[PDB]
Design a protein around this ligand. Structure first.
Ligand SMILES: *Cc1c(COP(=O)(O)O)cnc(C)c1O
Ligand SMILES: *Cc1c(COP(=O)(O)O)cnc(C)c1O
Lengths: 319, 323
């Protein structure tokens, strides 16, 4: 009975939290970041790929060797899915617009994932489409549907919320999280409000695609959040407030996380942290504790705008 | 600042990023070990805050120097010649504790690696590709000599590198295997890991075997010549001072292609995204676990770094053509 994992799946979750220090200068509340970046595959999606597979196995809808998993996604979910599929011997089909750059695709294939590329013009909607086409025809096919699947917010209610609740020893006052599939905010929010109805739950979205605030969907750079429609997995009743953060301000905060905290994080962690730092300057919050989710490591985004300013100075660096 | 329930009684929240270092999990190998007579449990340094075993020695070499008062933040300038993970581990520590950090490396170095280093605010000085590491080491010696409060870490010589392994990596594996690790397998670059863990583990139990790993193409510990290879992170081409050649019972030499192939299967069979040296170490581990002697015994092997860092190396170039 050794303290070793049987398999990669048992490594998921139980991520740690870290206080923000110098970047939190000025703030009257403490901020502790929940580092989903330290998931076996460096994002929060490692929890839902595990849980939507397992939830299904348990309900008896899927078995390894037989069922074929199918999901329209390239992002972090495809990755969370790919490594779970590798390790468990489920065949996996992931659809995405051809647009997808080599980087995520190389990594997805290295996991044995079959890639089906759809039409770049058609974006996500074209990908859901091929995937409904592939589900609708393929013998043993099974779709996860990350925006509708109750097991997405369920895993967060079962692990992520209790982790934050345990690590802060019930002291958490405010929980801040960006909304993509809505699963984090909903499962954590639900869990924490049942422990303590007084806690505040605060969502974050792009200023360029603020549909929960009211606005309409528009282009934005915050990879991971503002999917452009209200996802079924979002319980909007759970939130106390939504804060809109700009792309520029997400990217700037992400860079300061690296430069000041030594935390290498993605643009969405930057947006969540920008909002938490704002919330931590409100006088009514002196002394309180804010927990904020950083959904993914930043090394994954070397080719995106997060690192562009840095890329420009590196390209001209003389030998 | 704002007061925090700190110390032994307070919250389970790291005070800063340094406190996230170490305590990494182990995972048994399953279908990739089909056919082995021994159990294999991998030590996953790929799950360090910045994805490599080197996060442990960025921390300990810097902390060792503060503790002895050789350096202090906002005044000392850290300087290291480093083409691999050591610059990353120094970079995030330097950022979080407020040191200026200059890293030297040949201008061969991929651009993504530079980008990352510079996101942490490290300063980069590029050296002459023809001169390799030796040329970078030379330029780091010059900067040290010419910079008023410069301090060089010297990852190959600094005894804080193996010492952090004696104090953390070794103990963890011993706690985690509840003292049942029969054999320990590790790639050698600086020798730190093999030295600290082997030392710690021999001390607890001298019966435990310790096996080190090098490239077939640069197999100097087996009596061969130094040359060029691809198992990045090991086979530095000389025997470094941080290697206590005394605690090793054996050296297995594994090839680029088998290292590469083994990393590929770890991805495909285990769901484990690892660098090429994790493949070399794993391959070595696998053979050992197939020696009849070792039936029913427990092997621990180190996986030094996460694979995603290497999307541009030979590891992924066959997968890169497919796309
Ligand atoms: C999924 C994701 C989010 C949002 O998390 P949800 O629980 O889906 O709302 C934010 N950032 C990144 C990088 C993500 O992958
Ligand atoms: C550091 C390094 C090694 C070797 O470990 P040492 O303790 O230096 O002997 C192996 N692989 C990689 C990727 C490394 O960065």
């Amino acid at each position: 009975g050794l303290n070793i994992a049987d398999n990669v799946s048992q490594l998921i979750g139980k991520t740690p939290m870290v206080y923000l220090n110098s970047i939190a200068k000025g703030c009257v509340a403490n901020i502790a970041a929940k580092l989903e970046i330290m998931e076996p595959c460096c994002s929060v999606k490692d929890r839902i790929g595990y849980s939507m597979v397992t939830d299904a196995e348990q309900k008896g809808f899927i078995s390894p060797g037989k069922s074929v998993l199918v999901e329209p996604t390239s992002g972090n979910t495809g990755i969370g899915l790919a490594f779970i599929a590798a390790s468990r011997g489920y065949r996996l089909i992931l659809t995405m617009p051809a647009s997808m750059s080599m980087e995520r695709r190389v990594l997805l294939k290295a996991f044995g994932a079959e890639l089906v590329l759809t039409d770049p013009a058609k974006g996500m909607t074209g990908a859901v489409q091929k995937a409904e086409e592939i589900l609708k025809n393929t013998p043993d096919a099974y779709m996860l549907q990350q925006f509708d699947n109750p097991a997405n917010p369920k895993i967060h209610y079962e692990t992520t919320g209790p982790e934050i609740w345990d690590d802060t020893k019930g002291k958490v006052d405010i929980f801040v999280a960006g909304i993509g599939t809505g699963g984090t905010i909903t499962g954590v929010g639900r869990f924490i409000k049942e422990k303590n109805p007084k806690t505040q739950v605060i969502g974050v979205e792009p200023t360029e695609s603020d549909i929960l605030s009211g606005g309409k969907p528009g282009p934005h750079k915050i990879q991971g959040i503002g999917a452009g429609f209200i996802p079924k997995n979002l319980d909007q009743k759970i939130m106390d407030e939504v804060i809109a953060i700009s792309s520029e301000e997400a990217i700037e905060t992400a860079k300061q996380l690296a430069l000041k905290e030594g935390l290498m994080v993605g643009i969405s962690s930057g947006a969540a942290a920008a909002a938490a730092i704002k919330v931590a300057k409100r006088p009514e919050n002196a002394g309180k504790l804010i927990a904020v989710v950083f959904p993914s490591f930043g090394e994954r985004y070397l080719s995106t705008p997060l690192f562009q300013s840095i890329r420009e100075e590196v390209e001209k660096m003389q030998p």
